[PDB]
Structures are given as C-alpha cells and as structure tokens.
Write a protein that binds this ligand. Structure first.
Ligand SMILES: COc1ccc2[nH]c(-c3ccccc3)c(CCNC(C)=O)c2c1
Length: 486
C-alpha cells in the first residue's frame, strides 16, 4: 500500500483547512446575519465548534503520525488527542439530535399558534448535551480503552479492548439518536405533505348553499331515509387496509341496540365483492343503512362532507390521511382510529379517536358520538374548521432549511455507519474479528468519519441561500476591498 499512505495525507489536509475556515464562517455568518441569528441556530454553532475542535489539535497529530508511521508523542498526547475526538463526534450527534427535535417542535407549534416558535431554551439546552457527551466519553481514560492504532496512524477508541463499551457506544450514541432523528424528520415530512395536498379553495364551505340541517334533510331524503345522526364511510373496500370490515362488524353490534333506530349510515366504496355483499345485506336488512358502490364526483363528495354529522375513518394503516382533514374543512367531525397521520391531524378537541381494528370500540365511539346535542356539535365543527385552516396557513412557507438540516444528518450517518457497523462485528469476538475484518474497510470507515468534520460548511453553502449570501459578504468584506479617499 505505497500510494495509499500519501492519499490519506490529502484527505486530512483538505479536512483540516476546510473545517478550520468553513466552520469559522458558520459562527461568523450566524452572528453577522439577522435572518440566521435566531436562537434555533444556537445548535448549529455548538455543532460547528465540535467539528472545529478536532482540527486545532487531534488531526495535526494524526497527520504528522502518517509521515512518521508511528506515534512519536507522549502517552498524554495520545490519551488527550483521543479524548477530544470523542467529545467532538459524540457531541456532533447529540447536537444534530437537538436540531432534528427543534424543527419538529417548530412545525407542530406553528400549527397551533400564530407567533413563530422562539427556541427559547436553546443555549441552556446545549449545556445538557455537552454534559451528556462529557459523561459518555470520560470513563475511557480510567478503563484504558484509548490507544494508538498503527493502521490508521491515529490515537482513538480501541473497539476490541472491551465489547461492553463498544456496544454501549454503538446503541446509545448512534442507534438511539438515529432512531430519534429519523422519527423527527419523518413526522415533519408527513406534515409538510399534509400541507402540500389540501386544496383549500375546493374543500371550502362557501361552495355549499343553505344551512346544514336543511342540506342533511335533503341528502337523507335523496336516499330515502328520515332525519337522524348521519355517519359516512368513503374508502375502497378491503379485508385489511381502510377498514370497511371493522365498520360492518360495528353496525351489526349496534343493530340490536335501541339507539340504532336514531342512526343513519352512508357507506361509499368499491373493492372486495364479498364485503360489498356484506354491506348490501345490511342495506336490505335495515333502511337506515345505504351503500353506494360507484364512483362519486369530488364535487358531490364535498357536499356529503358538508351535509353529514360524522365521517368514520376506521383505517388499519393510513399514512397521510387527507380524508380526515378534507372532511374537517366542511365541518365533518371525524371518528377515526389512532394511526400515523390521523394522530398528527385529529386532536382530542376536534374529533374522536379509536383503537384501530376493533368493532366494539368503534361501536362505543359511534354511541359516544350519538350522545351529543345540537348545541354541543357546533363548537366541534368550529374546532374541526380551525384545525384544517392551520394546515393551509403553512402552504407558502420556505421549507428549504428542513432539507439543509436533514442533508447534514444524512451525510453524518453515511460517514459513521461503517465505523459503528464494524464496531458490532469487533464486539462479537474481539480476538477473532480484529484480524478477520478487511483491512481497507477499517481504514475507510475511520477516514470518512474524520472527513465529516469538514462537510457541514460545504452543505450549508450549497443548500441554504442565507449562508451563501453571507459567504459572499464575509469573504468580500475581510479580504476584498478597503477604505480609499479621493
Ligand atoms: C465513547 O468513547 C469514545 C472516545 C473517543 C472517541 N473517538 C472516536 C472517533 C472519532 C473520529 C473518527 C472515528 C472515531 C470515537 C468514536 C468511536 N466509535 C466506535 C463505534 O468505534 C470515540 C469514542
């Protein structure tokens, strides 16, 4: 591996200079730019320090130790250069975990309130992380798991010294954050999609005509059944997806009760012809249950939302669930099973929540829904309308900062995924798998993780226009131009 030594010098040389100047601009830009000066980006400076620390002291020692092919400094230099690298890399996730949490709170808050989320505790909240990162890394001095490795020319955490410490490192300081940050950004993506796909000019009460009671008496008279509390299912028919099967079991459970007489059901959809035969059966047996097996226009569906009292959404899985939100626009109060999407949308004040896949709990919800007077429903419909209106409030917003912080996270995971994956293979049998693991894969896994300390400024430049507009200002002020009297 002759040239493979010289190459490893380049990678660090790049990494140290880019990290030094790059993350120096990131601190400057946040202090210098009023748009980037918000307290939510306190985490970005804390992260840019963590990146920037390992280029002042550790990577210099490791760069020299490549050209030496050996450690030529003290054991303290080895024990301390290793220690700062751990304060960095562990702090760099737990910062990134904070950012992912911060921006989840930012979206959820801005739905519920009309005065931007302030990130009020962020400086105080950073000091919890740097205690958490100092508490996790500090035990490795006394246990003696920090030692020089000749393959990577560096002093670092030896995985093979104790598999108790590696598995604890890998689970608690990679897999636990990885799960938190995926969960955060996934639930953000659902909400930003729910925002994207809600046509407010279509799903609007304006397009309807009279009062509600009159429009309902019309709709029910149009199907040939009397006045009553009306319920509506509208989703394709299937044994386990959108949940028409749970509804039909629930209607049979209700049919015997005295309170059934005061109910009206309007089932819409097409799919399993046996479930269509089961629904058509309940149509023939009871005149208060109507079943519509063909394709209705969204024009007409709008009116049904506008006319009925409740919309039943008994879905097993339902990732986005606009059907709930669209219906709330026109005062339809959803009774809907707790699912990702519906748990985000439906609050406990707007509509009713049910344990998914249960005829009895759905029936007792329909019974709970029934025991509700005309005056009591008015506020529910108001809350439903206010709730759907908050999703359209976010439609024109700039969502690019979510991408910039997510791309930070994605590139982090890529760099440290190998090192943590290897660290589990080492943990299985330290004696066996230190030689058995491919020797290039060990070297690559480490030098990506180092290279990650120069990547944050490069990403902020390309994706966030405020940072790029400030790199122009920061660079063109210091270096470019000066005073000059004519
Ligand atoms: C928790 O104690 C420490 C203590 C010091 C540490 N230094 C590094 C490291 C820094 C840059 C590139 C590669 C590894 C780790 C991270 C080591 N993680 C694994 C799975 O081996 C580290 C951990």
């Amino acid at each position: 591996p002759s040239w493979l030594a010289s190459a490893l010098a380049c990678v660090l040389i790049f990494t140290i200079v880019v990290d030094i100047l790059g993350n120096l601009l990131v601190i400057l830009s946040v202090y210098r730019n009023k748009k980037l000066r918000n307290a939510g980006n306190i985490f970005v400076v804390s992260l840019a320090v963590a990146n920037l620390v390992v280029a002042i002291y550790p990577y210099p020692l490791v760069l020299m130790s490549i050209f030496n092919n050996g450690w030529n400094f003290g054991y303290l230099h080895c024990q301390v250069s290793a220690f700062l690298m751990g304060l960095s890399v562990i702090g760099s996730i737990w910062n990134i975990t904070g950012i992912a949490i911060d921006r989840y709170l930012y979206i959820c808050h801005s739905l519920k309130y009309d005065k931007l989320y302030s990130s009020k505790n962020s400086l105080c909240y950073v000091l919890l992380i740097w205690l958490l990162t100092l508490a996790a890394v500090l035990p490795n001095l006394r246990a003696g798991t920090l030692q020089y490795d000749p393959r990577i020319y560096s002093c670092t955490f030896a995985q093979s010294v104790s598999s108790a410490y590696t598995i604890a490192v890998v689970v608690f300081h990679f897999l636990v954050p990885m799960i938190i940050v995926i969960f955060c950004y996934l639930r953000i993506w659902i909400l930003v999609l729910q925002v994207r796909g809600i046509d407010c000019s279509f799903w609007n009460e304006s397009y309807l005509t009279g009062s509600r009671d009159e429009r309902k008496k019309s709709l029910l008279s149009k199907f040939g059944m009397d006045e009553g509390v009306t319920f509506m299912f509208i989703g394709r028919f299937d044994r386990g997806q959108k949940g028409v099967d749970v509804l039909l079991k629930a209607i049979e459970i209700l049919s015997s009760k005295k309170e059934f007489q005061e109910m009206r059901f309007i089932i819409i959809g097409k799919g399993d012809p046996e479930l269509e035969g089961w629904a058509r059966s309940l149509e023939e047996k009871h005149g208060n249950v109507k079943v519509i097996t063909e394709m209705l226009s969204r024009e007409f569906v709008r009116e049904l939302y506008g006319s009925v009292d409740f919309v039943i959404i008994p879905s097993y899985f339902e990732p986005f669930g606009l059907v709930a939100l669209e219906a709330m626009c026109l005062g339809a109060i959803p009774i809907a099973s707790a699912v990702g999407g519906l748990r985000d949308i439906i609050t406990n004040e707007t509509g009713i929540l049910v344990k998914a896949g249960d005829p009895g709990e759905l029936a007792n919800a329909i019974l709970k829904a029934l025991e509700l007077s005309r005056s009591d429903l008015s506020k529910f419909r108001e809350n439903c309308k206010k709730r759907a209106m908050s999703f359209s409030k976010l439609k024109p917003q700039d969502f690019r900062n979510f991408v910039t912080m997510f791309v930070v996270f994605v590139l982090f995971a890529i760099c440290f995924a190998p090192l943590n994956f290897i660290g589990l293979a080492v943990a299985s049998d330290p004696a066996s798998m230190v030689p058995r693991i491919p020797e290039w894969l060990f070297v690559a896994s480490y030098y990506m993780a180092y290279f990650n300390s120069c990547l944050n400024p490069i990403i902020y430049g390309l994706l966030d226009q405020n940072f790029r507009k400030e790199y122009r200002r920061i660079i063109v002020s210091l270096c470019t131009a000066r005073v000059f009297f004519v």
